[PDB]
Amino acid sequence: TCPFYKKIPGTGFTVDAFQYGVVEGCTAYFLTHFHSDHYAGLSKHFTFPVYCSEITGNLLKNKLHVQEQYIHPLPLDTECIVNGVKVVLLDANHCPGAVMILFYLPNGTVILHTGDFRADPSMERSLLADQKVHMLYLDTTYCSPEYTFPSQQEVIRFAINTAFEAVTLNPHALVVCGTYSIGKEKVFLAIADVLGSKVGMSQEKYKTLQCLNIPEINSLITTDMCSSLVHLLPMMQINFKGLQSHLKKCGGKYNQILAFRPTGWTHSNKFTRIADVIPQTKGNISIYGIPYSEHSSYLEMKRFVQWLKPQKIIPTVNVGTWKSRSTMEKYFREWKLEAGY
Numbered sequence: 001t002c003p004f005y006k007k008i009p010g011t012g013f014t015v016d017a018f019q020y021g022v023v024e025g026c027t028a029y030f031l032t033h034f035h036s037d038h039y040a041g042l043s044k045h046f047t048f049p050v051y052c053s054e055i056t057g058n059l060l061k062n063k064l065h066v067q068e069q070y071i072h073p074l075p076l077d078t079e080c081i082v083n084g085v086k087v088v089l090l091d092a093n094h095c096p097g098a099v100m101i102l103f104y105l106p107n108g109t110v111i112l113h114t115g116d117f118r119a120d121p122s123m124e125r126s127l128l129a130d131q132k133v134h135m136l137y138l139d140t141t142y143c144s145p146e147y148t149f150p151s152q153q154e155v156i157r158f159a160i161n162t163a164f165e166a167v168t169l170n171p172h173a174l175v176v177c178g179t180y181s182i183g184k185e186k187v188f189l190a191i192a193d194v195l196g197s198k199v200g201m202s203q204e205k206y207k208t209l210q211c212l213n214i215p216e217i218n219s220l221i222t223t224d225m226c227s228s229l230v231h232l233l234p235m236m237q238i239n240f241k242g243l244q245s246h247l248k249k250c251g252g253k254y255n256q257i258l259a260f261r262p263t264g265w266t267h268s269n270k271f272t273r274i275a276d277v278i279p280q281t282k283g284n285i286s287i288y289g290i291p292y293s294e295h296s297s298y299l300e301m302k303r304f305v306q307w308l309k310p311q312k313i314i315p316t317v318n319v320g321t322w323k324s325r326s327t328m329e330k331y332f333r334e335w336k337l338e339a340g341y
């Protein structure tokens, strides 16, 4: 059955609730983004209205075969009316197509559902600046002070410099980047751009990326693995055995692999700066775990909330244990006391 934190009171709406069958009294199903924990349940047999971004809708039509008549894409940063309720979609700074949803209830309550997000001060100048929020349904993925991470920009600087140096020293090295869902495309696109190469990938992954409106994508991606020195592989193949095997498949075009695993967080962050990151190496294969996150750090999250000053916070992540829930609730109290709301 559907959890309460996926239900929008005073409406017929749900958010990211497609794995529960027909939800009682739900007249419209919102999808914040195309990640499997959120879309789980959608298919060509779904016949209720789905509201989402343009990019998410492209992905529903092409990858899951949802019929066009049931997909209702909305433009961003635009007041729209859904079953008599005003809504606005905002950029969530997550993966492509990912949104936050603002709901303006008939009785005057205003609700912000962040979906998955990486808070940023640029959000303090959208349609959020323009009114009060009574309830915040918050992506609390990294809601603990140990989660610190660098900027996406610092992480991409590290990756480009590392790959550029490696291929300059050995023009026969291959660079590999792991992926398992949309998101984190800057990793592999920025490396390919500095090396003067396209990113080679499976036909299935190329079709996924063509669904995204990313300008100049014919320009950075390809299915011709032969002509490329940056290859994209499933995240599960980013280990010494998987990569030895891949190297064998390239027919002696290459003699070394430098691979990257963009992860959310790793406890190395508590003791190490980005400049100090080192790989795991075996033979002619090196693997770098880099802290490229598409979720808020603890400090980012805290800043957002102390700026927005919601009347009530409803966590959407880590809610399944009493200890985590209690931990989060204690931080929310601190933030409120410190900010004076």
Ligand code: NI
Residues within 6 Å of the ligand: 033, 035, 094, 116
């Ligand atoms: Ni996500």
